[PDB]
Amino acid sequence: FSGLEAAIVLIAFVVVAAVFSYVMLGAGFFATQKSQEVTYSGMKQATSNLILDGM
């Protein structure tokens, strides 16, 4: 049994990690960038209120 083949796999473990890492970050930024949008809209929802002024 040789670690030469272990290397072959170790790539695969690392690569799928990096890809998941890659996407999760992308998934994550979008998560964040979405989380920001709802917040901006959220404040804009309340503060965009319009009012009847006087009689």
Add this chain to the structure above:
Amino acid sequence: FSGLEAAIVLIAFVVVAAVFSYVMLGAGFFATQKSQEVTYSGMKQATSNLILDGM
């Protein structure tokens, strides 16, 4: 140790979040829509007053 399994869980963390998010919103709208009803009834409680007029 592989992040492949971490993904499996990451779904679960997200899903229960979305379901809680889903329900909390539903719980929340009802909270609001209830909070509105008591207000409408609240003003209607005071303003629905009836009066004896004159002798």
